[PDB]
Amino acid sequence: GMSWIKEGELSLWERFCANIIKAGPMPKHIAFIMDGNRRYAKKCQVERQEGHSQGFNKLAETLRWCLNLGILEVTVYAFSIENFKRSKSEVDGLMDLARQKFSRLMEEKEKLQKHGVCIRVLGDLHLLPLDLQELIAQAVQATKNYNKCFLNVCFAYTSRHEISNAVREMAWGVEQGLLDPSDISESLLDKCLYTNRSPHPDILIRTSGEVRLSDFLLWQTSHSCLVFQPVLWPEYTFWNLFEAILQFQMNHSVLQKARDMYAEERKRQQLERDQATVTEQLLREGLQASGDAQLRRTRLHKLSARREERVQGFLQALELKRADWLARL
Amino acid sequence: GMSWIKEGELSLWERFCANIIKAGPMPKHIAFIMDGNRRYAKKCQVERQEGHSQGFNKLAETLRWCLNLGILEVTVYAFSIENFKRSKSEVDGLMDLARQKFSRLMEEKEKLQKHGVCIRVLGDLHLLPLDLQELIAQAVQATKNYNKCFLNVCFAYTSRHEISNAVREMAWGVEQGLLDPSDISESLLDKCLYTNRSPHPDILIRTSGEVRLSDFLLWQTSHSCLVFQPVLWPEYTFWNLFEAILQFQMNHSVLQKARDMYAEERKRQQLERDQATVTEQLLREGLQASGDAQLRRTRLHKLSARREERVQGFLQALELKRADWLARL
Amino acid sequence: AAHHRMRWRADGRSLEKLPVHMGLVITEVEQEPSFSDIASLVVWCMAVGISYISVYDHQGIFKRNNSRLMDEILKQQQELDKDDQVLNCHLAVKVLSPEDGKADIVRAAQDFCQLVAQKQKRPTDLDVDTLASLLSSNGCPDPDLVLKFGPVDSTLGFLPWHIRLTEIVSLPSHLNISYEDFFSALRQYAACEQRLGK
Amino acid sequence: AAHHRMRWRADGRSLEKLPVHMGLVITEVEQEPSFSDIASLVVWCMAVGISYISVYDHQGIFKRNNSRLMDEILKQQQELDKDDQVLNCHLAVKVLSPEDGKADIVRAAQDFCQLVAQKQKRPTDLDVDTLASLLSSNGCPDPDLVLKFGPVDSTLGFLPWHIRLTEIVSLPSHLNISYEDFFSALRQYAACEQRLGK
Ligand SMILES: CC(C)=CCC/C(C)=C/CC/C(C)=C\CC/C(C)=C/CSP(=O)(O)OP(=O)(O)O
Ligand SMILES: CC(C)=CCC/C(C)=C/CC/C(C)=C\CC/C(C)=C/CSP(=O)(O)OP(=O)(O)O
Ligand SMILES: [Mg+2]
Ligand SMILES: [Mg+2]
């Protein structure tokens, strides 16, 4: 019923295969690099603006496929910072498309509240036209408290800009006294990305023949099933999506083993780093020579606890700063 | 058939109760402080030498009880270094008893080889008369390769002298280059005691009304069931022994829990000590900052291995020095 | 006054003998440690005239909760110049654990074997009298009496070297210990007899 | 002569383009590592003219067995002045593991946040160009091409920051890799096209 998710059920064959794969592990979060719109427009002999508009139609149809498959969170690469280097005519065309597609979202409100659709827009959003920022902000504010499904539009986004911003936020926390520099950790950087509300994608899909990530979710897709498919994005089918899920299911056991051992090893190296730090403060100022009193055990438990409360207080400030939005008004 | 273990089976009631207790944990090694011979002689109005001779009769009878109960290793306190301060007449009487009881052992050889009786005599044996040393050495040499049951006579023994000698052996190993001083450990000191061939006693029994250990197996009985019984040693009965075993069975679960946690804690503190040592050599000479290469893991595995071979080579020398016996000739 | 100090001193002086060093071995560790009972025992030894008291448990709980125990001792000692009262208990009271037994004898062996390596000492120079002076309690006598509380019939690794002649008296629990029970164990020690091998 | 050096150089020069930095991601770790196959790939890149080669596995086996791999590389490089041959491979070859990716970006964040704490730098002074120069590979280009071997469809935490534009070509196994297979992947990279957002 809405303009951002098409209304339609799976056909018999799609439903049947879906039922079969749903007997195994299913992805929770799928990320799309929607690529090939312009080649598709040239192929059909239509204007490049119609290639991109067909691209939005395929998005809405694909979110319906995910929702029918029980995949409730989707991240899409809608506009790169690098895309600002296209012609004004083409850049204008994409901003105009976003102006039209957003706001249509707003007209279709309550229908979003009915389906529980939370819409997040992630990127260095200050480079967008001011009107587009206010309209993005209104859509994000309205769907803030919805949780039946999640769509993350990466607009004016690159991964390096996202990662550089996450460091800057951690540096801001140090500058304001919320954190010590020793509090920085891989898990802390996770919580300072724009994607911090969602788990890392199970699958990265990139369409058209390109076998590169193009500055998209580099941090987040380090252990994700990577699927490169030749199809141009406006011609994406249910079966392209199905094939990608089959790829995920084939990799799942080894990819989870690797994911588990990475986390097992990262925590083990953090224990060694803190164990040596507890000894450094213990080797200094007298000698430990302990022992039954379990002094090192208490200093280590107190070390992580005081570290936990600092980062927890730091994040409440970071969300508060991110929630402060004159733009929704 | 032998003069050091009486021949006789359990009566009906002893056999019945034995069967019942053998359904639970049974001691493997019991240590006796055989005390009260002289008060017993005064009580029966016999000479003090007959009190001590009744004391040997009770030993042989008690080893038969243990053997019937399936308890195959026994350690007894036959003569303290402190006992040298008794009168010459009394000291002479005890040496003469040992001269007679040993050598009778030698006459009863082959009967020891038939029952697999290994006889060990532990103490600062150089303070004994030279003839008594040669006769002890002949008995110990003859039963060296027997293993059906074990009796350890502590003769001219104290625990402090035993512990001081164990340190001296470890110091000797350092002096000769077999060990580094950092190789000394609680487990190494265990293997340098005279009792090193036997496990630590499950029970310490002391007879007569004395509630002290009198420099006996202090290191070895740190987690042993201590049983103090008023009975004078020449009047020891099967039921005194039975009562002590019941005490052991009552303490067994908590005593093994304490024994297990002591060993769990001792090994944990040794890991911390070596972990910090591996870092000290790693913090010195560059910085570790590791890591995936598992450098600390290899240095720790190599540390204990080179420690194991040193102590293993040290002990082969210690037994060789202890086996070198002009005295058996 | 108190007064009461004189009465307790007259109790200790009336015994045939009194321990100079006493150990308190607690074999059952309670969930919330009963410091008050432990502190009462310590204060009674001090009031009757015992110079050194060692508190021990196999799991090292009292060593981990040392300041809560000293606080309870000094609170109970006021009833019946805090710095003088504090150091007087730091010098008479030690809180021990397994590491103070076998691990300390191993520490003394390493240090002496370190001197054999530096040619400063010979293995033969380590008699039992030398080893005794190298332990942590070099300037404090061996325990004369040990009060062992609880259901375990073991010293549980307490000072194995020092208890060669210690009298070991057992009481089923420390949990509501009374002065009469504590002093009854003192009468048992006073009547003990040590012949020293003779 | 060899000679063969000229033939391999003519192969690299014939391609429309060649990687300056290439990564080798091994997603399946063999029981006894196949250093010879890995060493052959490294030597081929050097012979055809690739300046930097990074070897990677998620479990850090090649980093733990670094000298066995460099030995095999230099052995295979002799066929088809050892100090000059050694340092030439120490400078062109790096053996990487997961810690060289996300853990290194965290290291750069700690050091910069250490300067914000010392008032030597401001958070706003950290643009994407500054962060790039603060990483471990500050003086070495980003990988142009990654050859990924084995059955896993993931980069497994390899240099997440540096692979923003890396072409990723997949081969099912490195286990008996041939020059023709390796050079076929080079033809794929040569034909790749990067429009840089335009
Ligand atoms: C944010 C925005 C613009 C619109 C909002 C609505 C929305 C999320 C639409 C989906 C985003 C769509 C349709 C396209 C993504 C923009 C884009 C240039 C993708 C690469 S296709 P290329 O042009 O590169 O084609 P070739 O590779 O063939 O050259
Ligand atoms: C080694 C040797 C001597 C003989 C070899 C045979 C042998 C092992 C015999 C068993 C050892 C025997 C019988 C007695 C142990 C010697 C002794 C003085 C024990 C304390 S009884 P105390 O005299 O103290 O009696 P109270 O306390 O009433 O004064
Ligand atoms: Mg494109
Ligand atoms: Mg006696």
Q: Are D153 and A226 an interchain contact pair (Cβ–Cβ within 8 Å)? A: yes
Residue B117 φ/ψ, nearest 5 degrees: -90, 120
Going by C-alpha positions, the residue among D188, C34, C65, C193 that lies closest to residue A212 is: D188
What's the 3-state SS for chain C?
A: CCCHHHHHHHHHHHCCCCCCEEEEEECCCCCCCCHHHHHHHHHHHHHHCCCEEEEEECCCHHHHCHHHHHHHHHHHHHCCCHHHHHHHHHHHEEEECHHHCHHHHHHHHHHHHHHHHCCCCCHHHCCHHHHHHCCCCCCCCCCCEEEEECCCCCCCCCCCCCCCCCEEEEECCCCCCCHHHHHHHHHHHHCCCCCCCC
Q: How far is the CA of C152 from the centre of ligand 4 (A)?
A: 26
Q: Are A212 and D106 an interchain contact pair (Cβ–Cβ within 8 Å)? A: no
Say what the resolution is, in angstroms: 2.4
Q: How far C185 CA lies from chain A's nearest CA (Å)? A: 30
Q: Are B170 and C109 an interchain contact pair (Cβ–Cβ within 8 Å)? A: yes
| Amino acid identity for residue A52 in this structure | H
User: How far apart are alpha carbons D160 and D98 in whole angstroms?
Assistant: 10
Give the CA angle between residues A189, A191, A196 to the nearest 5°.
Answer: 125
Closest CB from B211, B218, B269 relative to C161 = B218
**Residue B181: domain span:** 16-265+308-323
DSSP codes, A298-315: HHHHHHHHHHHHHHHHHH
Length of chain D: 198
Query: Structure tokens of B279?
Result: 């870092």
Q: How far B298 CA lies from chain D's nearest CA (Å)? A: 10
Q: Are C156 and B179 an interchain contact pair (Cβ–Cβ within 8 Å)? A: no
Answer whether residue B237 is part of any domain: yes
Going by C-alpha positions, the residue among D163, B25, D176, B107 that lies closest to residue A159 is: D163
Pairing of strands C93-96, C52-57: parallel
Among A170, A189, A245, A314, most D C-beta atoms within 10 A, so best to mutate, is A170
C-beta of residue A303 within 8 angstroms of C-beta of residue A274: yes
Site of tokens 């609680």: B186
**Burial state string for B120-145 with b = 16 or more CB within 10 A and e = fewer than 16:** bbbbbbeebeeebbebbbbbbebbee
Strand order in the sheet with D145-149: D93-96, D52-57, D21-26, D145-149, D167-171
B291, closest residue in chain A (CA to CA): A269
Answer whether residue A9 is part of any domain: no
Going by C-alpha positions, the residue among B81, B75, B84, B69 that lies closest to residue B24 is: B69
Q: How far is the CA of A47 from the centre of ligand 1 (A)?
A: 14
What are the E-state strand segments in chain A? 29-33, 73-80, 117-122, 149-157, 203-206, 225-228
User: How far apart are alpha carbons A312 and A189 in whole angstroms?
Assistant: 13
The preferred substitution site among B2, B79, B81, B106 for testing ligand 2, maximizing ligand atoms within 8 Å of CB, is B79
- Domain tally for chain B? 1
What CATH superfamily classification does D4-98+141-188 receive? Answer: Decaprenyl diphosphate synthase-like (3.40.1180.10)
**Cβ atoms within 10 Å of D124's Cβ, excluding its own:** 10
User: How far apart are alpha carbons C2 and B196 in whole angstroms?
Assistant: 56
Q: Exposure of D67 by Cβ count < 10 A (0-12 exposed, 13-18 middle, 19+ buried)? A: exposed
Query: Structure tokens of A101?
Result: 């597609």
DSSP designation for A81: G
Which H/E stretch holds residue B82? Answer: none
Helix or strand or coil: residue B222?
Answer: coil
| Amino acid identity for residue B1 in this structure | G
C-beta of residue C27 within 8 angstroms of C-beta of residue A256: no
**Cβ atoms within 10 Å of D92's Cβ, excluding its own:** 18
H helical segments located in A36-158: 37-44, 48-68, 88-107, 111-115, 130-142
Whether D contacts C, i.e. 3 or more CB pairs less than 8 A apart, is: no
Site of tokens 């891989």: A186
| Amino acid identity for residue C22 in this structure | M
Helix or strand or coil: residue B26?
Answer: coil
**C-alpha separations of A170 from A4, A189, C33, D109, D116 in Å:** 35, 8, 44, 8, 10
User: Which residues, judged by CB distance below 6 Å to any ligand atom, belong to the binding site of ligand 2?
Assistant: B 34-39, 52, 55-56, 59, 76, 78-79, 83, 94, 97-98, 101, 153, 155, 208
Q: Are C64 and A292 an interchain contact pair (Cβ–Cβ within 8 Å)? A: yes
Rg (C-alpha) for chain D, rounded Å, is: 18
| Amino acid identity for residue A212 in this structure | R
Atom of ligand 2 nearest to the CA of B233: 21
Q: Exposure of B109 by Cβ count < 10 A (0-12 exposed, 13-18 middle, 19+ buried)? A: middle
Length of chain B: 329
Which H/E stretch holds residue B153? Answer: strand B149-157
Closest CB from D98, D109, D155 relative to A170 = D109
**Burial state string for B15-27 with b = 16 or more CB within 10 A and e = fewer than 16:** eebbeeeeeeebb
User: How far apart are alpha carbons C65 and C17 in whole angstroms?
Assistant: 32
Q: How far apart are the first and last CA of chain D?
A: 47
Task: Find the Cα–Cα–Cα–Cα dihedral B290, B291, B296, B302, rounded to 10°.
Answer: -120
Helix or strand or coil: residue D191?
Answer: coil
> In the CATH hierarchy, which fold is given to the domain comprising C4-98+141-190?
Undecaprenyl pyrophosphate synthetase (3.40.1180)
**Residue partners of A320: CB distance under 8 A and separation at least 6:** none
What are the E-state strand segments in chain D? 21-26, 52-57, 93-96, 145-149, 167-171
Query: Structure tokens of B136?
Result: 């002890």
Cβ contacts (< 8 Å) between A289 and chain C: which residues? none
User: How far apart are alpha carbons D167 and B312 in whole angstroms?
Assistant: 57
Experimental method used, please? Answer: X-ray
User: How far apart are alpha carbons C9 and C5 in whole angstroms?
Assistant: 6
Q: How far B7 CA lies from chain C's nearest CA (Å)? A: 33
User: How far apart are alpha carbons B176 and A124 in whole angstroms?
Assistant: 73
Phi-psi region of B116 (alpha: psi -120 to 50; beta: other; left: phi over 0): left
Closest CB from A276, A292, A296 relative to B279 = A276
Whether the bond into A24 is cis, omega within 30 of 0? no
Query: Which CATH number characterizes residue B216's domain?
Result: 3.40.1180.10
Site of tokens 């391999």: D8
D59, closest residue in chain B (CA to CA): B292
C-beta of residue D154 within 8 angstroms of C-beta of residue A224: yes
Q: Which ligand is nearest to the CA of A135?
A: 1
Distance of CA B147 to the CA centre of its chain: 15
**Burial state string for C19-56 with b = 16 or more CB within 10 A and e = fewer than 16:** bebbbbbbbeeeeebbbebbbbbbbbbbbbbbebbbbb
Chains touching C, CB cut-off 8 Å, 3+ pairs: A, B
| Amino acid identity for residue C40 in this structure | S
Cβ contacts (< 8 Å) between A275 and chain B: which residues? 275
Q: How far A260 CA lies from chain D's nearest CA (Å)? A: 12
Q: How far C68 CA lies from chain A's nearest CA (Å)? A: 14
**Residue partners of A60: CB distance under 8 A and separation at least 6:** A3, A4, A5, A6
What are the residue ranges spanned by the domains of chain D?
4-98+141-188
User: How far apart are alpha carbons A15 and D198 in whole angstroms?
Assistant: 39
Strand order in the sheet with A149-157: A117-122, A149-157, A73-80, A29-33, A203-206, A225-228
Going by C-alpha positions, the residue among B265, B267, B185 that lies closest to residue C106 is: B185
User: Which residues, judged by CB distance below 6 Å to any ligand atom, belong to the binding site of ligand 1?
Assistant: A 34-39, 52, 55-56, 59, 76, 78-79, 83, 94, 97-98, 101, 153, 155, 208
**Cβ atoms within 10 Å of B284's Cβ, excluding its own:** 8
Cβ contacts (< 8 Å) between A180 and chain D: which residues? 117
Chains touching A, CB cut-off 8 Å, 3+ pairs: B, C, D
The preferred substitution site among B2, B3, B5, B35 for testing ligand 2, maximizing ligand atoms within 8 Å of CB, is B35
Which H/E stretch holds residue D33? Answer: none
| Amino acid identity for residue B146 in this structure | Y
Rg (C-alpha) for chain A, rounded Å, is: 23
Strand order in the sheet with C167-171: C93-96, C52-57, C21-26, C145-149, C167-171
C-beta of residue C165 within 8 angstroms of C-beta of residue C194: yes
Going by C-alpha positions, the residue among A217, A200, A205 that lies closest to residue A159 is: A217
A-C interface: how many C-beta pairs under 8 angstroms?
14
The preferred substitution site among A52, A122, A128 for testing ligand 1, maximizing ligand atoms within 8 Å of CB, is A52
Which residue lies with its CA nearest to atom 6 of ligand 2? B98
Whether the bond into D58 is cis, omega within 30 of 0? no
Among A262, A271, A275, A300, most B C-beta atoms within 10 A, so best to mutate, is A275
Rg (C-alpha) for chain B, rounded Å, is: 23
Phi-psi region of A208 (alpha: psi -120 to 50; beta: other; left: phi over 0): left
Tally helices (H) and strands (E) across chain A. 10, 6
